[PDB]
Symmetry: C7
Subunit: 52 residues, 7 copies
Amino acid sequence: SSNYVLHTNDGRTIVAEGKPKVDDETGMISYTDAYGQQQQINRDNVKEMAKG
Amino acid sequence: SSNYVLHTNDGRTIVAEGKPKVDDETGMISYTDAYGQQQQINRDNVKEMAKGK
Amino acid sequence: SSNYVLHTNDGRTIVAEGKPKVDDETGMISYTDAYGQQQQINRDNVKEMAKGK
Amino acid sequence: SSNYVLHTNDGRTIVAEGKPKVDDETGMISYTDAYGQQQQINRDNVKEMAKG
Amino acid sequence: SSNYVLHTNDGRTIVAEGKPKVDDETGMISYTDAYGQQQQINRDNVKEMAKG
Amino acid sequence: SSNYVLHTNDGRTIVAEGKPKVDDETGMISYTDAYGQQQQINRDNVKEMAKG
Amino acid sequence: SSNYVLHTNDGRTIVAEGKPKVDDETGMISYTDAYGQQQQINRDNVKEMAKG
């Protein structure tokens, strides 16, 4: 898939390898960063998301 | 479909191609912008929107 | 149709034609303004609502 | 009638004729004021409520 | 029965006759005070509760 | 019952006998302290909890 | 069998032995720390989480 770009509410821009989605087991937004590591972020700190 | 205009708490005015709707797998408001890029925005960052303008 | 007046948390009063209601597709309060335009407003920005003119 | 008084965030004391209740269509607390007009107030703006 | 004491976020303690419970019609915490009068308070204004 | 140690957001430590859990009737975290008193605390004021 | 790292609001970097998950009884994020102790932390207090 194409990369996705997340904009945090703390001024950061994060690249994800695929579409970030809520992990029903944690309630947080799960994604894979550019280094291929699985990450999760509090949804309250995610302002926007763009495909590409 | 008629475009919608969203106003964010950040002061931005954003144009969507169709009615923005919550995406069940993200919990955020999903839409496609005027440029055709698929975007999502936290509902807490949306102040209001209108159908057309 | 009965009109409503929405009072926002930012000092605005908006006239609605028909009772504003939560739109499950967006999670925001949906209504039609005095000009026939469909609008949506974040529930957190709605302080009170009065039925009438 | 059953008379209630709502105490709001901004310090107001509002008289309601009949028990105020959430309107599931709006998610807000619905009530009839001392003048017979139907009112609705955001739940987050209501601090306390009392019969009297 | 037994009394309960509620501690609000505004530095106040209210005595309740019986266990306060959410009134599903209002979404607030419902209880009967010492005066035997029906009272309701926004859950966001309740810090703690104790059974006396 | 096994003890649990709760830490509030305002920096206090509270010992519970038995696992604290949400009381569906109040929406708050319910527990019995080490001294046998039934208490409840607003979830928003609970930072963390540890078994032991 | 991979470990996880939780980043909290107060700048803590907590190692979890296993993927943290919400506990339906408390509504908080449940996990086991490096010392084998069962811990729980308010979702609102977790900024991010990383696998590795």
